Amino acid sequence: EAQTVISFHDGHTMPQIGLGVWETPPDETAEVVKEAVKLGYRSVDTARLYKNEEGVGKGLEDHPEIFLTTKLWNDEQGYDSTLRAYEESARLLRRPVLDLYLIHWPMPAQGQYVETWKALVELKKSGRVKSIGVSNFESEHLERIMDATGVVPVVNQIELHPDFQQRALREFHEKHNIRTESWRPLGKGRVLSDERIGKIAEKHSRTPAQVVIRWHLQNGLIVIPKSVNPKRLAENLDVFGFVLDADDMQAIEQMDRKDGRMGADPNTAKF
């Protein structure tokens, strides 16, 4: 039962499930990354925010095949600053050419995300990075960057889980051939004890976590679940052995809530 992959509009391809690295210190980070790779993760996602790209870099040492994504933090937005930030990240990650680079937040009040996107466009044009995308962008922000550059992000990585399904934004992505990547895919773990999910889990002899990740997969979404537990890491990846049926998919669709968002709202975020 092979893992699936999602391909971008730019012709590049990304494993559909990856490891969300969080605020693990460098040293523990290397060992988590090494363990996850041993387990069969083919993709790792980190961010400058986390200050652990050195750890990820060391954990991926003999693993050039692993799809590597990182993100430019808010305080490095700007054309020249983003160029410098990308080159620093590539050094710390010990991968001269990264697979995906993302703007972490639009931060509209900063007024810098458009010039940041131009830097990413230049990084892609010059061959310094394979693919470029964004994170936490609303449709308006996507419109702005596409209008200014004519270059469409391959991915927008957004908070997405059964309580907050981002349906309207996904309709916009669809229209522009932008892939959706889900962060917080388990909604902090809250959904894992939901009865509706539990019933679907019993139905397939899988865990609630496995049901939820499979739901993201069946929606064509790239998913980066986070775990520090080797057992849960293994479990989260074991999701190519079953299929959620139409009834299941409808049942999860019904969980969407107007007040489901758990993280910052892009339009109002201040750090």
Ligand SMILES: NC(=O)C1=CN([C@@H]2O[C@H](COP(=O)(O)OP(=O)(O)OC[C@H]3O[C@@H](n4cnc5c(N)ncnc54)[C@H](OP(=O)(O)O)[C@@H]3O)[C@@H](O)[C@H]2O)C=CC1
């Ligand atoms: N682009 C952005 O702005 C942001 C991106 N992110 C990304 O998304 C993630 C968000 O964090 P979080 O809400 O914790 O993410 P998730 O929705 O992936 O939930 C992870 C939590 O659930 C637990 N868990 C994972 N697998 C299982 C399982 N099989 N069974 C039971 N429990 C499980 C974990 O505990 P344990 O680790 O002990 O297994 C952890 O506490 C981070 O990895 C980060 O990379 C986060 C914030 C912002």
